[PDB]
Structure 1
Amino acid sequence: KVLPDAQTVTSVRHWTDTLFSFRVTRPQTLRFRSGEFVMIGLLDDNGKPIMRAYSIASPAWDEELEFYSIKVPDGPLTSRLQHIKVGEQIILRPKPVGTLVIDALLPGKRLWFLATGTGIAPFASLMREPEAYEKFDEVIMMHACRTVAELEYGRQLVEALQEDPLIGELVEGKLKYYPTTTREEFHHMGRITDNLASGKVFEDLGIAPMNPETDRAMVCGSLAFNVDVMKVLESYGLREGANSEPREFVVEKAFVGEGI
């Protein structure tokens, strides 16, 4: 007996006791755009498919798929998914959707990535999307978590990109990674909303206050984070709007609920 739409696991890398990433074989049928998400899952006691929405953390051009996942004890899926091993499989619906796609935007000089927690996942994909560096001139990556260890997955991803011999210094003065913690001490602190309103992120990167003038950003955090951020965006003059139609910015829930 086989598992419908089952992909094999090629690697697992634990980052903290609540965060882990892993890569799987790509369904020979999958065709997507960096930033979209799909459904993945495992089987429970009776053999029931527990499905959950997951951003594809790897760029569209990758032959393998990568996922960055939260680990919730009691979580039906993650309490299970966190134990996945190389060779083991998972279910993966090859139906890619999501509003976090570059097409949903259109302008040019800036493409901001504003995320918190695992909401970095889609940007781990987009930050490695060639289109982001062609249809746009500068990519800002704002990631805010509670502690430094939660920044690790995205910080090592960013370090590798820049330190890479060729692709590095190619994302030279294109990508600007602005990580922040809100609990642990870290050279750059403060929440994304606050640092945008107060303008710190501007006099920090030595740039021009995010104006609705052909700018652009994608938001991915909790619901409270999305509304807060959206408000702050318009506070400058940006307007929502998704998949296939000119707009100022897009958002997506990094998860449903209040978060752990």
Structure 2
Amino acid sequence: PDAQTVTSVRHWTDTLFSFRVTRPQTLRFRSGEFVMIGLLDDNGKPIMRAYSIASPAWDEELEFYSIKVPDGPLTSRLQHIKVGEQIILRPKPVGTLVIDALLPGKRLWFLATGTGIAPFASLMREPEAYEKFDEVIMMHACRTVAELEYGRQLVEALQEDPLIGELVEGKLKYYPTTTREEFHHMGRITDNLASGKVFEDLGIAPMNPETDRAMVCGSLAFNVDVMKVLESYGLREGANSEPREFVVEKY
């Protein structure tokens, strides 16, 4: 049943975990895309859900970053997955969070809350991002410090990696914030873009449609709020068939 085997699991909190799985031979994707994964219910019927692939396209192993919803049909079960066990993975990638769906530009922004960092876990490790852009800005906002941990460790490890670390050097700017716990930088993405705080903090020019391209991943509310701010700076939604300055993915 499109089965793949789990090779690693890390629990970040009781409501957040990541895992790696073997890669289907026929899967060809672009960093930022998503696929469907799942498990069988009591009656043998698949419980299938859209998931961003959190590993870059070049990686022979796949990574996922998952919520656990206590009464959620999939994740109430998926949270208990172990190394050596199998998941269903349909190798049909889709999604608009891909570099091909943006006009060429100079700065690339990843704007994520919660598990929305997942496609950017992929793209931050994608050579094409650093080939096609001079700066890559990762804004990740969560309520609590523990919710940032998967991403903070990902960025530490990629910065230390002799291959990826070299590609991202002087290009990747990582801007994690919390909104409900004290942390070195705080505040919503919407608010820190609108006030210009992120520009002040990183010491970079304000957002403009000539140079900036952006990708958004998170809840419906998050996307709605962030889109309004992007539009306030003159950036337009495109995806493809007609690429423009930003793309969004809402769940």
Question: In 1, are the aligned partners of 2:69 and 2:76 still within 8 Å (CA)?
Answer: yes
Structure 2 partner of 1:73: 70
Question: Offset at 1:166?
Answer: 4.3
**Secondary structure at 1:91 match in 2:** strand
Question: Offset at 1:244?
Answer: 4.5
**Secondary structure at 1:245 match in 2:** coil
**Secondary structure at 2:222 match in 1:** helix
Name the CA distance, whole Å, in 1 between partners of 2:167 and 2:108. 17
1:116-174 CA-to-partner distances (Å, cap 9, x unmatched) read 00000000000000000011110000000000110000010001111223432431110
Question: Offset at 1:107?
Answer: 2.1
Question: In 1, are the aligned partners of 2:125 and 2:164 still within 8 Å (CA)?
Answer: no
Name the CA distance, whole Å, in 1 between partners of 2:240 and 2:148. 29
**Secondary structure at 2:168 match in 1:** coil
Name the CA distance, whole Å, in 1 between partners of 2:39 and 2:201. 43
Q: TM-score, normalised by structure 1?
A: 0.94
Question: In 1, are the aligned partners of 2:105 and 2:210 still within 8 Å (CA)?
Answer: no
Name the CA distance, whole Å, in 1 between partners of 2:219 and 2:152. 21
Question: Offset at 1:72?
Answer: 0.7
Question: In 2, are the aligned partners of 1:41 and 1:49 still within 8 Å (CA)?
Answer: yes
**Which of 136, 151, 154 is the aligned partner of 1:154?**
151
1:182-239 CA-to-partner distances (Å, cap 9, x unmatched) read 0010010010000000000000000000111131000011111111111100100000
Name the CA distance, whole Å, in 2 between partners of 1:188 and 1:84. 34
CA RMSD in angstroms, aligned pairs only: 0.9
Question: In 2, are the aligned partners of 1:103 and 1:244 still within 8 Å (CA)?
Answer: no
Structure 1 residues not aligned, in runs of 5+: 254-260
Which structure has greater helix proportion? 2
Quick check: 1:179 aligned with 2:138? Answer: no
Question: In 1, are the aligned partners of 2:127 and 2:167 still within 8 Å (CA)?
Answer: no
Question: Quick check: 177-186 or 241-250, which moved more?
Answer: 241-250
Structure 2 partner of 1:225: 222
Structure 1 partner of 2:48: 51
**Secondary structure at 2:154 match in 1:** helix
Name the CA distance, whole Å, in 2 between partners of 1:50 and 1:167. 35
Question: In 1, are the aligned partners of 2:237 and 2:246 still within 8 Å (CA)?
Answer: yes
Question: In 2, are the aligned partners of 1:9 and 1:85 still within 8 Å (CA)?
Answer: yes
Question: In 1, are the aligned partners of 2:130 and 2:167 still within 8 Å (CA)?
Answer: no
Q: 1:184 to 1:6 in 2, by over 3 A?
A: same
Name the CA distance, whole Å, in 2 between partners of 1:174 and 1:115. 18
Name the CA distance, whole Å, in 1 between partners of 2:240 and 2:12. 32
Name the CA distance, whole Å, in 2 between partners of 1:244 and 1:14. 39
Structure 2 residues not aligned, in runs of 5+: none
Question: In 2, are the aligned partners of 1:110 and 1:137 still within 8 Å (CA)?
Answer: yes
Name the CA distance, whole Å, in 2 between partners of 1:105 and 1:60. 18
Name the CA distance, whole Å, in 1 between partners of 2:104 and 2:211. 5
Matched pairs, number: 250
Structure 2 partner of 1:167: 164
Name the CA distance, whole Å, in 2 between partners of 1:164 and 1:147. 27
Percent of pairs with identical residues:
100
Name the CA distance, whole Å, in 1 between partners of 2:28 and 2:164. 24
Question: Offset at 1:14?
Answer: 0.6
Question: In 1, are the aligned partners of 2:65 and 2:118 still within 8 Å (CA)?
Answer: yes
Name the CA distance, whole Å, in 1 between partners of 2:220 and 2:237. 15
